[PDB]
Ligand binder design. Structure first.
Ligand SMILES: *[C@@H]1O[C@H](CO)[C@@H](O)[C@H](O)[C@H]1NC(C)=O
Ligand SMILES: *[C@@H]1O[C@H](CO)[C@@H](O)[C@H](O)[C@H]1NC(C)=O
Ligand SMILES: *[C@@H]1O[C@H](CO)[C@@H](O)[C@H](O)[C@H]1NC(C)=O
Ligand SMILES: *[C@@H]1O[C@H](CO)[C@@H](O)[C@H](O)[C@H]1NC(C)=O
Ligand SMILES: *[C@@H]1O[C@H](CO)[C@@H](O)[C@H](O)[C@H]1NC(C)=O
Ligand SMILES: *[C@@H]1O[C@H](CO)[C@@H](O)[C@H](O)[C@H]1NC(C)=O
Ligand SMILES: *[C@@H]1O[C@H](CO)[C@@H](O)[C@H](O)[C@H]1NC(C)=O
Ligand SMILES: *[C@@H]1O[C@H](CO)[C@@H](O)[C@H](O)[C@H]1NC(C)=O
Ligand SMILES: *[C@@H]1O[C@H](CO)[C@@H](O)[C@H](O)[C@H]1NC(C)=O
Ligand SMILES: *[C@@H]1O[C@H](CO)[C@@H](O)[C@H](O)[C@H]1NC(C)=O
Ligand SMILES: *[C@@H]1O[C@H](CO)[C@@H](O)[C@H](O)[C@H]1NC(C)=O
Ligand SMILES: *[C@@H]1O[C@H](CO)[C@@H](O)[C@H](O)[C@H]1NC(C)=O
Ligand SMILES: *[C@@H]1O[C@H](CO)[C@@H](O)[C@H](O)[C@H]1NC(C)=O
Ligand SMILES: *[C@@H]1O[C@H](CO)[C@@H](O)[C@H](O)[C@H]1NC(C)=O
Lengths: 39, 910, 124, 80, 48, 48
C-alpha cells in the first residue's frame, strides 16, 4: 500500500496518462511472476 | 476446377547476383498455397495486378495471349503469339524475337509489360523464374485470354524472404504474410525458429472509408478584383484587402513562389486570415505572385526600358495555417459524417485516421480543436454541424508468436497483447488485422490472460515448470501434439515436521560437483571510421573531415574497451605469482584429477574438460566485416597462456591447499587438506578419514558426470555463446547498416557523386554520412554498456577465484549450493568455469532433542554439539553428521541450575 | 555507474576490512587479514591493509592419526608433526610443537580404518 | 602507402612488426603487442614472448607438510 | 529494488503515427527500430 | 517538438508541401524522433 505503481501492465479494454502513452505506441508488459507468486 | 499453387511462382526480383544470403523483397508475387484456377483442354480472364500462368503439356497447345481492356477496335490491345519459328508482339509497337511445365509471370507497371518465365521437365517443388523481357506497350490491361491443363494465379504485393544458394540460385522462400510462423521467420530473417515467444508485428484495424468535412460556404473569393485591377497602388502605399467567408480556388491564377506551402496544394488547405497586398515594382507563410506589367503601366516606366526595369505587378498572399476556425479555403466536396468506425478523416485540412465518437468535452464557442498532453489533436468541432467529436485511433496492439521450435513442430500459438478476447480483431476481409493472416477460434483454444488473449493453446488445469513464458504467471509448452497453456508451478510443496523437541540429523553425505560459467572478456573490436563511412570515396573523406573529432572519440572509447578486456583477463587468471607444476606421480589419496589436469598428449596442453569447453563454444562473414573497416584485435593472453595460468592455480590448490594464495606454498597431503576443509564446515576430521575412499569415489563420480552435464545439455555454455553471438550480431548489424539510404537517393557514394551536381550531391552525401555516423555512435555506446556488464562479470569471476579457489568460503551459495569444500577453475574461450566441490548432507533421521540436561542439580549444555536420543539413552552429536557419543563432563559445560532452561531434560553425565 | 560500483566496493571494504576482520581471501590485502586503516585521497580512499604472511617454512613428516592402545587419536586443533623420531602436535599456521597428550587430541575408532596412522605414545 | 613515411621484420598474429628484434628470452610484459608478444627497450627495441612467472614445483608427498616457523607483518595499499 | 517496469515501444506508431507515407519513408532507415526492439526485449527478459 | 521543421505534425507537412521539400522536413522530424527513441533506450539500458 506504500508504493503506488504506474501501470502494472494488465489488460486495458477499449473504452488517462497510460491511455495517451498507449496511443503513442508505448506499452507496459506484465511481469512473469505475479505478486501472489512472489509472496 | 481449382487447385493448390503450393510454393510456386517465385521469380528473381532483380538483375543483381547474390549468393549464400537471405534477402527480403517486397514485390508482386503469387502467395504460397493460393487457390489457382485450373482449365482443361477459353474465357477472357481478368488481368488484375499481374498473372502467373502455368502449362503442363507436351503438344504445344498453348501458343500465346491477348491483352487489353475491351478487346475491341475502340481500345488499343496487346497480342503475343509464339509461332514455331518466332514470337510476335504487336500493340504503335511491334516486336519479334526467338510433359513439360512452362511457368510464366506477366506484370504491367508504369507503361512496362514485364515477362518472366521458367521451363521444367501442380508439382510440389521449388523453381525460380528468370526474366524474359520488358516492353513499352503503354496501355492499361484489364483482361487477357490464352490463345489455343493450364493454371492461372493472380499476383499481389507481398514480402518474400528468398534464400540464395552458394552458386546464387534461389532454392527456398518464405511468404511473410502466409501465417504467423512465416511472419516469425521473416522477422528473424531465418528459415529455422527455436523454441520461444517472438514479438513479430502489430495488428492495426484499417480505415473502412474516407470522409471530408469542409465549411458550407460556396461564394467565390474576390480574387478577380485584386489581380484584375485597373490600376495597382504604389510600392510604398501598398494596397491590402481582406479575404473572408469564400472559396479560394487558386486554379484561376509569371513568377508564383510560396513560402511554407506549395502552389500545387493550395486548393486543399483551409486558411484563417487571408490578406492580399498589391503594388508595382521594377523587375512568413504565404505566396508571392509577380508578373510583368509592361503593357499595363518615381520609376517612370517606359516601353523602351529593359526587362530589369520594366514595370511588374506584385501580389502577396498572406495566411495563417495555425488552424483556428477556417473562413477561406478551396473547392472540396464534403461527405457524410461517419461515426463509431475507423475512417480516414479530413476536417478543414486536418487529416488523420481513426474512430470519431460523440464527445462530452465542454468546448467554448471560439474553440475549434482539442489537444492531448502530447499536443496532438484529440477532439474536433465539426465545421458544419458544430458538434464536438472525439478522435481515438482505431484498434491496434502487439502480436507475439509462441513456437515449440521448427525442429519439433510447425504449430504456433498467437498472443494478442493487452487485449481481451471479446475485442480481438475478428475480420472476414483484408481490411483489418495488419498481419493479414487469421487464427480462428475453435472454442477450447482461446484463453484470456492478464497479458492478453492467447489463441491456439488449450488451458490445462495442471501445473508444470515454465517452458515458454507468456506472462502474469502463465506459460506454454508443446504437450506431445498440441500447445498447452498453464499456470506455472513454483515447485513441489513440502511441510517440515516442526515440533517443540524434534531435530533431524544427517547420517550420510554426498560430494557434489557443480558448474558455474562466468564471462570474463569479450571480443576486442577496432573500427576504421573513414573506411566504414566512406570506403574508397575520396570526396566522402574530404567531406567527412569537417565533422570534427567524432572518429577520434570512437577510437578512444574502443581502445579503452580493448584494454579493459585484457585487464579483465589478467585480474581473473593472473592471481598466482608462481607457475606451479603438478608432481610426476598423480596419486592424491584416491582423488582423480585427470579430467581437470592438463593432458601432455594434446598440443595445447589443455584438460579434457577444457577441450570440451573449447569445442562447445564457437569463437566469409569476417572478411566481409574486414572489407568495411571492422576488425578484431587479438587478446594479449593466448589460450595456451590462460590454460597455463589455470594449470598453475590447479597445481597450487592440489599440492598446497589454500596456503599459496596467502603466501609461500606449503605442501600438505591431499587427504589432510580435505580433513582441513571438512573441519571448515563443522565436521570432525575423522569423518573424512574413516570415509576417505568413499569420499574419493563420490568425487571421482561427480567429476566424471561433469563432462556429460556439459556435452549433453544444449545450452550449458549459453552465457559465453551469448557473448560471442552479441559481438557477431553487433558487427553484422553494423555491416548491414551500410545498405540503408537514410532518405538519400542511394546508399552508394560513388553513384551519388557520378550522377549529381556537387550542390545536391552534398545534401545526399550528408544524409548518408549522418546516418552512418549515428550507426557508429550507437554501436560504440552499446559496446560501452556491454563492456561495463562484462567488467562486472569479470570482477565477480576474480572474486570467485580468490574466495573459492584460493580459499574455502563460508558465504552461503557463493561457491556452489551446499557447504563449500573447494573449487577448481577451467579456462573457457571467453571466460572461466568453476567446478565447485561441496558437501551436501543426506539421509537425515529424526531424534528427540533438549536444550540442556539437569544432573546433580546443575544445567549442562553441549560444548560442540546437540543433545539427541534414541528414545531411551541421551547422546551428544555434531550437528551435520550423526555421530552420537556418551554425554560426559568433557563434551559438556555447566551453567546455572536446571530451573530456568525451558525444556531441560533429566539424564546422567558420566 | 562505474564510479558508483567502485564506491560501493569501497564502502564494503570500509565495513568489512576497517570495521571488522575479514575472512574473505584477498578482499583486504594479500595474506591473512589482520586489520585495515583508511586514508582520504582527493577523489577516493586508500586502505592500508595489515596482513600476516607466514615465512620461514620447515618440512616435517605428518600423519593423519596416532595409534595408541588400539585407539586412533586425531588432533583437536592442530596437525601431527615429527622431528624424525618424536611426534608432536602443532597449530597449523605457526610451528609450536607440543607433547601429544590426551588433552590436545580426541579418540575415534580403532587403528584399522585410517590410512597412514602411525604408532606413538599419547601421554595422559 | 598512406603514412608516406617508411621504416627487424617480424610476423605476429597482431600483424607485421618492423623495427623490433625478436629475442628468444622471456621477460615480464613491458609494452603489450598482442597474442603473447610484448615489446621492450633493451640501446634497442626487442620483441619477445611474455613470461607468466617463475616455474615452481611444490614438493608434494603423501606424508610431508611444510609449516611456517616465522611470520612477516605486511602493510599493503589499495586505492579506490 | 529488484526489477523495473517492462516497456515495449511500437517504433512505427511513435515515429509515424497513422501516416503511411512516413512509415514508407521509415522503411529506408535500416534496422533502427529492430535494434531498439531487441534492446527493450532484452531489458524486459532481464527484469524477470 | 519540431526539430527545425515547419510543424510537428506529419500530415500537415505532407498536405502543405511538395515532395522535394516535404522530404527535408520529414527527414528532420524522423531524425529527431529516432534520436528521442534512441536516447530513451540508452538511458533504459543504463538504468537496467
Ligand atoms: C552450385 O554450382 C556449382 C557449379 O558446379 C556446384 O559445384 C555446386 O555444387 C552448386 N551448389 C549447390 C548445389 O549447393
Ligand atoms: C482576369 O480576367 C481574365 C479574363 O477576363 C480571366 O481569364 C482571369 O481568370 C481573371 N483573373 C482573375 C484572377 O480572376
Ligand atoms: C474484456 O471485455 C469483456 C466484455 O466486457 C469483459 O468481460 C472482460 O473482463 C474484459 N477483459 C478483462 C481482462 O477484463
Ligand atoms: C509444542 O508445539 C505444539 C504444537 O505442535 C504446541 O501445542 C505446544 O504448546 C508446544 N509446546 C509448548 C511448550 O508450548
Ligand atoms: C552413504 O551413502 C553411500 C552412497 O553414496 C553408501 O554407499 C553408504 O552405504 C551410505 N552409508 C550409510 C551409513 O548409509
Ligand atoms: C582417472 O579417471 C580416468 C577417467 O575416468 C581413468 O581413465 C583413469 O584410469 C583414472 N586414474 C586412475 C589412477 O584410476
Ligand atoms: C520425521 O518425522 C516426520 C513426522 O513426525 C516424518 O514425516 C518424517 O518422515 C520423519 N523422518 C524420518 C527420517 O523418519
Ligand atoms: C539407543 O541407542 C543405541 C546406539 O548406541 C542403540 O543400540 C539402541 O537400540 C537405542 N535404544 C533404543 C530403545 O532405540
Ligand atoms: C528432574 O529431576 C528433578 C530431581 O529433583 C525433579 O525435581 C524434576 O521434576 C525432574 N524433571 C522432570 C521433567 O521430571
Ligand atoms: C622440503 O623438501 C623438499 C624435497 O626434499 C625440498 O625441495 C624443499 O626445499 C624442502 N623445504 C624446505 C623448507 O626446506
Ligand atoms: C625431536 O624433538 C625433541 C624436542 O623435544 C628434540 O630431541 C629435537 O628437537 C628433535 N630431534 C631432532 C633429531 O630434531
Ligand atoms: C603399529 O602397531 C600395530 C600393533 O601394535 C602393528 O600391527 C603395526 O604393524 C604397527 N605399525 C608399524 C608401522 O609398525
Ligand atoms: C606415497 O608417495 C610415494 C612417493 O611419492 C609413492 O611411492 C607411494 O605410492 C604413495 N602412496 C601410495 C599409496 O601410492
Ligand atoms: C623471525 O624473523 C625476524 C625478522 O622479521 C627475526 O628477527 C627473528 O629472529 C626470526 N625468528 C626466528 C625464530 O627465526
Amino acid at each position: 500500500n506504500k508504493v503506488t505503481l504506474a501501470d502494472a501492465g494488465f489488460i486495458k479494454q477499449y473504452g488517462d496518462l497510460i491511455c495517451a502513452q498507449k496511443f503513442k505506441g508505448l506499452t507496459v508488459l506484465p511481469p512473469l511472476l505475479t505478486d501472489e507468486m512472489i509472496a | 476446377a481449382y487447385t493448390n499453387s503450393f510454393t510456386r511462382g517465385v521469380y528473381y526480383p532483380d538483375k543483381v547476383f547474390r549468393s549464400s544470403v537471405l534477402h527480403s523483397t517486397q514485390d508482386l508475387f503469387l502467395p504460397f498455397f493460393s487457390n489457382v484456377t485450373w482449365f482443361h483442354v477459353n474465357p477472357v480472364l481478368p488481368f488484375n495486378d499481374g498473372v502467373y500462368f502455368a502449362s503442363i503439356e507436351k503438344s504445344n497447345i498453348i501458343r500465346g495471349w491477348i491483352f487489353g481492356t475491351t478487346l475491341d477496335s475502340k481500345t488499343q490491345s496487346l497480342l503475343i503469339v509464339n509461332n514455331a519459328t518466332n514470337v510476335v508482339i504487336k500493340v504503335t509497337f511491334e516486336y519479334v524475337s526467338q510433359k513439360n511445365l512452362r511457368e510464366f509471370v506477366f506484370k504491367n507497371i508504369d507503361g512496362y509489360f514485364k515477362i518472366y518465365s521458367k521451363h521444367t521437365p501442380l508439382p510440389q517443388g521449388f523453381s525460380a523464374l528468370e526474366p524474359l523481357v520488358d516492353l513499352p506497350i503503354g496501355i492499361n490491361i484489364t483482361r487477357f485470354q490464352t490463345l489455343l491443363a493450364y493454371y492461372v494465379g493472380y499476383l499481389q504485393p507481398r514480402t518474400f524472404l528468398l534464400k540464395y544458394n552458394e552458386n546464387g540460385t534461389i532454392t527456398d522462400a518464405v511468404d511473410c504474410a502466409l501465417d504467423p510462423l512465416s511472419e516469425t521467420k521473416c522477422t528473424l530473417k531465418s528459415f529455422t525458429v527455436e523454441k520461444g515467444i517472438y514479438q513479430t508485428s502489430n495488428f492495426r484495424v484499417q480505415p473502412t472509408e474516407s470522409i471530408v468535412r469542409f465549411p458550407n460556404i460556396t461564394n467565390l473569393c474576390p480574387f478577380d478584383e485584386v489581380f484584375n485591377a485597373t490600376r495597382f497602388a504604389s510600392v510604398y502605399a501598398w494596397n491590402r484587402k481582406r479575404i473572408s467567408n469564400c472559396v479560394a480556388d487558386y486554379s484561376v491564377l509569371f513568377t508564383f513562389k510560396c513560402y511554407g506551402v506549395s502552389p500545387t496544394k493550395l486548393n486543399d488547405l483551409c486558411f484563417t486570415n487571408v490578406y492580399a497586398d498589391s503594388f508595382v515594382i521594377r523587375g512568413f507563410t504565404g505566396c508571392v505572385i509577380a508578373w510583368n506589367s509592361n503593357k499595363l503601366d518615381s520609376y517612370s516606366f517606359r516601353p523602351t526600358y529593359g526587362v530589369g526595369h520594366q514595370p511588374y505587378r506584385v501580389v502577396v498572399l498572406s495566411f495563417e495555417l495555425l488552424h483556428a476556425p477556417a473562413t477561406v479555403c478551396g473547392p472540396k466536396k464534403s461527405t457524410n459524417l461517419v461515426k463509431n468506425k475507423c475512417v480516414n478523416f479530413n476536417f478543414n485540412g486536418l487529416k488523420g485516421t481513426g474512430v470519431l465518437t460523440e464527445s462530452n468535452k465542454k468546448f467554448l464557442p471560439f474553440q475549434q480543436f482539442g489537444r492531448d498532453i502530447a499536443d496532438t489533436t484529440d477532439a474536433v468541432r465539426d465545421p458544419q454541424t458544430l458538434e464536438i467529436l472525439d478522435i481515438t485511433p482505431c484498434s491496434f496492439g502487439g502480436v507475439s508468436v509462441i513456437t515449440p521450435g521448427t525442429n519439433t513442430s510447425n504449430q504456433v500459438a498467437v498472443l494478442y497483447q493487452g487485449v481481451n478476447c471479446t475485442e480481438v480483431p475478428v475480420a472476414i476481409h483484408a481490411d483489418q488485422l495488419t498481419p493479414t493472416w487469421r487464427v480462428y477460434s475453435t472454442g477450447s483454444n482461446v484463453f484470456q490472460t492478464r497479458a492478453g488473449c492467447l489463441i491456439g493453446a488449450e488451458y490445462v488445469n495442471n501445473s508444470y515448470e515454465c517452458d515458454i513464458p507468456i506472462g502474469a504467471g502463465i506459460c506454454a509448452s508443446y504437450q506431445t501434439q498440441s500447445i498447452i497453456a498453464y499456470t506455472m508451478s513454483l515447485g513441489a510443496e513440502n511441510s517440515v515436521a516442526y515440533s517443540n523437541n524434534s531435530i533431524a540429523i544427517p547420517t550420510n553425505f554426498t560430494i557434489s560437483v557443480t558448474t558455474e560459467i562466468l564471462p570474463v572478456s569479450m571480443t576486442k573490436t577496432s573500427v576504421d571510421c573513414t573506411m566504414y563511412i566512406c570506403g574508397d570515396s575520396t570526396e566522402c573523406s574530404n567531406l567527412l573531415l569537417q565533422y570534427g573529432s567524432f572518429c577520434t572519440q570512437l577510437k578512444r572509447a574502443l581502445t579503452g574497451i580493448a584494454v579493459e578486456q585484457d585487464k579483465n583477463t589478467q585480474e581473473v587468471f593472473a592471481q598466482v605469482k608462481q607457475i606451479y607444476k603438478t608432481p610426476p606421480i598423480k596419486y592424491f589419496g584416491g582423488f582423480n584429477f585427470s579430467q581437470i589436469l592438463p593432458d601432455p598428449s594434446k598440443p595445447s596442453k589443455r584438460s579434457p574438460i577444457e577441450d570440451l569447453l573449447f569445442n562447445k563454444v564457437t569463437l566469409d562473414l569476417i572478411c566481409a566485416q574486414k572489407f568495411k573497416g571492422l576488425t578484431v584485435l587479438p587478446p594479449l593472453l593466448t589460450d595456451e597462456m590462460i590454460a597455463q595460468y589455470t594449470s598453475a592455480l590447479l597445481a597450487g590448490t592440489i599440492t598446497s591447499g589454500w596456503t599459496f594464495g596467502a603466501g609461500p606454498a606449503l605442501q600438505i597431503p591431499f587427504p589432510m587438506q580435505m580433513a582441513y576443509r571438512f573441519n571448515g564446515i563443522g565436521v570432525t576430521q575423522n569423518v573424512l578419514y574413516e570415509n576417505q575412499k568413499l569420499i574419493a569415489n563420490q568425487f571421482n563420480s561427480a567429476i566424471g558426470k561433469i563432462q556429460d552435464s556439459l556435452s549433453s545439455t544444449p545450452s550449458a555454455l549459453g552465457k559465453l555463446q551469448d557473448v560471442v553471438n552479441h559481438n557477431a550480431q553487433a558487427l553484422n548489424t553494423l555491416v548491414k547498416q551500410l545498405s540503408s539510404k537514410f532518405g538519400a537517393i542511394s546508399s552508394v557514394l560513388n553513384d551519388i557523386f557520378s550522377r549529381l551536381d556537387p550542390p545536391e550531391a552534398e545534401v545526399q552525401i550528408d544524409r548518408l554520412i549522418t546516418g552512418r555516423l549515428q550507426s557508429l555512435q550507437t554501436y560504440v555506446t552499446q559496446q560501452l554498456i556491454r563492456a561495463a556488464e562484462i567488467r562486472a562479470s569479470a570482477n565477480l569471476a576474480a572474486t570467485k577465484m580468490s574466495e573459492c579457489v584460493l580459499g574455502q568460503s563460508k558465504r552461503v551459495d557463493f561457491c556452489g549450493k551446499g557447504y563449500h569444500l573447494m573449487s577448481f577453475p577451467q579456462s573457457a574461450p571467453h571466460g572461466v568455469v568453476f567446478l565447485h566441490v561441496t558437501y551436501v548432507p543426506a539421509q537425515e533421521k529424526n531424534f528427540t532433542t533438549a536444550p540442556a540436561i539437569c544432573h546433580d542439580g546443575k544445567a549442562h549444555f553441549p560444548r560442540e554439539g546437540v543433545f539427541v536420543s534414541n528414545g531411551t539413552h541421551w547422546f551428544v552429536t555434531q550437528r551435520n553428521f550423526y555421530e552420537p557419543q556418551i554425554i560426559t563432563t568433557d563434551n559438556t559445560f555447566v551453567s546455572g541450575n536446571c530451573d530456568v532452561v525451558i525444556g531441560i531434560v533429566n539424564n546422567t553425565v558420566y | 555507474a562505474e564510479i558508483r560500483a567502485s564506491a560501493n566496493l569501497a564502502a564494503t571494504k570500509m565495513s568489512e576490512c576497517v570495521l571488522g576482520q575479514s575472512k574473505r581471501v584477498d578482499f583486504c590485502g594479500k595474506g591473512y587479514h589482520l586489520m585495515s586503516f583508511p586514508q582520504s585521497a582527493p577523489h577516493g580512499v586508500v586502505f592500508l591493509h595489515v596482513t600476516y604472511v607466514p615465512a620461514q617454512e620447515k618440512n616435517f613428516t605428518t600423519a593423519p592419526a596416532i595409534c595408541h592402545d588400539g585407539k586412533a587419536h586425531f588432533p583437536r586443533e592442530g596437525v601431527f608433526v615429527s622431528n624424525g623420531t618424536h611426534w608432536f602436535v602443532t597449530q597449523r599456521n605457526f610451528y609450536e610443537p607440543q607433547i601429544i597428550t590426551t588433552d590436545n587430541t580426541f579418540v575415534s575408532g580403532n587403528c584399522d580404518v585410517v590410512i597412514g596412522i602411525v604408532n606413538n605414545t599419547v601421554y595422559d
